[PDB]
Design a protein around this ligand. Structure first.
Ligand SMILES: CCCCN[C@H]1C[C@](O)(CO)[C@@H](O)[C@H](O)[C@H]1O
Length: 765
């Protein structure tokens, strides 16, 4: 049954718009295969098209906004794009039609509507670019009857090992096609759909913009050569219209020019399936997908008071679809430093200068290939896999489709190396690398990241104890399926746990340091004077100067999270030998959080260092870090420590702002200093952990039940209203929120853990 379910999931999720880095494109979950991408741009002059043309995602003044209105990666969805520069409201509908043995079929409608400010006679170029990698695969544009290009549909027939036989059709579409009366029309046609079929070495096929411009430029050079000049120039759109040359190749460029509004379809027909897909199929499946999305949303994301209104529902749908609609498939080599230089052990004072010296040896090399199936923080700015982000992204996704989430966990855990390391940032392939400065590409095997994917595993453990529809929950409906998944993942989890302990260990024994356990103490590797990138809270203030005797209460809490998980999963597999070990680790972390990290004088948790005089010193900076044992679910409901944290969480002059909890307290000397990333702004991921823990305390007998209930109520309201208010004003989710003004700031399109707001609204943790 497990294998059966495995196979149905593979066939179900194979195809998608899995290229989140571009406005619209498709590719299957196969490294070297068929990929498509859309481009468009107005043409007004002889030189504007190069500046107007859209392909990879961006966010600036000339783009109003864009995003998925509805999406489900089993069925497809609809994306809206509001382009001010090109005067166009674009819509791209995508739909999957299950069938055959090769992952099924799919279709897309592309619709462009000029906005109110565009000239009614705007010319717009639209290109559908298609490429295929693979040694023994073939793709061929059937040539047109007509001399100079196509009056109707363009049909590409192809074959490969992974897809078998298939046909990909770009329809003629609806809309006015401009006509040139120039002499050029004798050799180039008066204006029509054209195809160029080309070949390049497989590894550059992703470079669609340059490949296309190299063809445009060759066209313009042909004009110059054949005496078409400024005495009497062809119209711009004709100058940028490729000469028709369909054929066989691993690249096919299909180019249309439209005057005014347009629309056209793309129909991918898997030959092994029924009859080929048609436009009338597309329209039906589109309408159907929406119905299904609507029904599932209302059930899984049942917004509770005071967010029951339709305004909130539209908001929740937008935040959710953008999160799930970011899922991408990535494939290629990544840049890793595998020197294991000994400077990276950071055992001396001043270690940061040493580690920089080793970095400047530049011993990094490309390795893999790797593949990854993952959601992403931000389409225009962070279109790739981030380890601790991914745990937050999957919490809402798992609610919607637990099997999709488990698939993404599996994907991430299959990257893990023999030591138990997964790189915090997955930059796979030249395409992914293109959008990332070289200095920032290299991954370091001593860098951890918060293990937030354990949070998702925890939700799945609890659910397991207590056609597309069936597939989405098959891992909890079939209890032997679930346990098998856990049996196979479990050794990897254990390895990650052991890896943390060997690589991110702090030093008790070697200092005058007293504590319940000799073993349990942690220090994030990777810190510079100014930063601690690996903890995820980049510039949150830490002991100065950084020092080999530092201990980090965040990191120790993340270890608590992990043991708790390994206890539940261990139990389920009756790994009683292991369960007993974890139980003692937990017990010790519980004690050592107190002995090493608790400040009586301050009433909160603190990181620790070693003095000038070699003594242990707490260094307290009140903010997210201070609450960590609480955020991560390690405190008993009656703990007096918990009571004191509830005081600090609730205190307006410290963390509590009208807009959510501040990353750092207004009292700390580092409030609003430096780059001010984690030194005052309100962050939805950490607020989310707070809300979940307040709620937990609120719904059990104990001395803080009602303080927690008051805080839960108000923080849930403040968080959701902050994000909603900004969405309404700007159309964006943002990375963080300003505690003084409420405004969203930094990275836009941040879906992204900001989307956790859909789970907060729907409550019932
Ligand atoms: C020098 C670049 C640092 C930017 N990091 C922020 C974005 C992201 O890295 C991806 O969402 C998160 O993983 C971090 O934790 C955030 O702080």
């Amino acid at each position: 049954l497990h294998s059966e379910i495995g196979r149905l999931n593979n066939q179900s999720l194979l195809w998608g718009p899995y290229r989140p880095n571009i406005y619209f494109g498709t590719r299957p979950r196969i490294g070297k295969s068929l990929m498509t991408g859309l481009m468009w741009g107005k043409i007004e002059s002889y030189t504007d098209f190069q500046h107007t043309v859209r392909y990879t995602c961006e966010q600036n003044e000339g783009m109003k906004g864009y995003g998925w209105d509805e999406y489900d990666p089993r069925r497809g969805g609809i994306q809206s794009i509001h382009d001010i520069q090109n005067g166009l409201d674009i819509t791209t509908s995508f739909v999957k039609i299950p069938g055959g043995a090769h992952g099924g079929s799919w279709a897309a409608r592309i619709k462009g509507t000029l906005n109110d400010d565009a000239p009614k006679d705007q010319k717009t170029i639209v290109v559908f670019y298609v490429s295929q990698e693979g040694e023994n695969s073939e793709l061929e544009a059937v040539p047109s009857e007509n001399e100079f290009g196509y009056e109707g549909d363009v049909i590409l027939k192809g074959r490969s090992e992974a897809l078998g036989n298939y046909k990909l059709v770009v329809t003629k579409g609806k809309g006015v096609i401009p006509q040139s009366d120039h002499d050029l029309s004798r050799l180039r046609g008066p204006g029509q759909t054209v195809v160029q079929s080309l070949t390049y070495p497989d590894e550059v096929l992703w470079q669609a913009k340059p490949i296309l411009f190299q063809q445009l430029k060759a066209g313009i050079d042909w004009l110059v050569e054949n005496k078409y000049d400024v005495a009497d120039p062809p119209p711009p759109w004709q100058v940028y219209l490729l000469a028709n040359k369909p054929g066989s190749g691993n690249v096919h460029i299909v180019q249309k020019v439209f005057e005014g509004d347009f629309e056209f379809d793309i129909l991918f027909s898997s030959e092994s399936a029924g009859k080929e897909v048609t436009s009338k199929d597309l329209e039906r499946e589109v309408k159907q997908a929406t119905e299904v999305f609507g029904e599932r949303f209302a059930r899984v994301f049942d917004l509770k008071a005071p967010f029951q209104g339709d305004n909130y529902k539209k908001f929740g749908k937008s935040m959710f679809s953008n999160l799930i609609g970011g899922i991408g498939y990535f494939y290629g080599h990544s840049l890793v430093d595998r020197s294991y230089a000994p400077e990276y052990d950071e055992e001396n004072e001043g270690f940061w200068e040493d580690a920089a010296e080793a970095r400047a040896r530049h011993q990094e090399a490309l390795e893999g290939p790797y593949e990854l199936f993952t959601s992403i923080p931000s389409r225009p700015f962070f279109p790739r896999g981030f380890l601790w982000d991914e745990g937050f992204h999957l919490l809402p996704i798992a609610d919607w489709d637990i099997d999709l989430a488990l698939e993404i966990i599996k994907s991430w855990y299959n990257l893990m190396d023999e030591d138990g390391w997964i790189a915090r940032e997955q930059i796979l392939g030249a395409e992914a690398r293109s959008k990332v400065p070289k200095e920032f590409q290299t991954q370091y095997p001593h860098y951890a990241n918060p293990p937030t994917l354990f949070l998702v595993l925890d939700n799945f453990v609890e659910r397991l104890r207590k056609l597309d529809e069936t597939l989405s929950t098959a891992s909890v409906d079939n209890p032997e399926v679930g346990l098998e998944y856990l049996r196979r993942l479990y050794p990897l989890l254990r390895r990650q746990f052991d890896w943390f302990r060997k690589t991110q260990a702090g030093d008790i024994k070697s200092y005058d340091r007293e504590a319940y356990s000799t073993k349990e103490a942690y220090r994030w590797r990777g810190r510079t004077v100014s930063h601690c990138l690996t903890s995820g809270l980049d510039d949150y203030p830490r002991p100065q100067p950084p020092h080999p005797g530092e201990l980090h209460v965040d990191l120790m809490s993340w270890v608590g999270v992990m043991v708790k998980s390994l206890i539940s999963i261990g139990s389920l597999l009756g790994a009683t030998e292991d369960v007993e070990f974890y139980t003692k680790v937990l017990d010790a972390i519980e004690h050592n959080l107190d002995d090493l990290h608790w400040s009586e004088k301050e009433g909160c948790y603190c990181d620790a260092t070693i003095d000038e005089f070699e003594e242990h010193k707490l260094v307290c900076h009140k903010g997210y870090i201070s609450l960590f044992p609480f955020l991560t679910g390690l405190l008993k409901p009656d703990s007096p420590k918990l009571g004191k944290l509830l005081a600090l969480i609730g205190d307006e002059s410290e963390l509590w702002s009208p807009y959510g909890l501040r990353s750092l307290s207004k009292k700390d000397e580092f409030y609003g200093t430096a780059e001010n990333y984690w030194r005052s702004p309100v962050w939805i991921n950490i607020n989310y952990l707070a809300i979940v823990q307040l709620y937990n305390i609120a719904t059990q007998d104990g001395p803080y039940k009602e303080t927690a209930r008051d805080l839960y109520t108000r923080l849930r309201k403040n968080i959701v209203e902050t994000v909603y208010r900004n969405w309404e004003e700007t159309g964006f989710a943002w990375e963080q929120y300003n505690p003084e003004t409420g405004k969203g700031q930094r990275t836009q399109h941040f879906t992204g853990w900001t989307s956790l707001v859909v789970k907060i609204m729907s409550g019932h943790h």
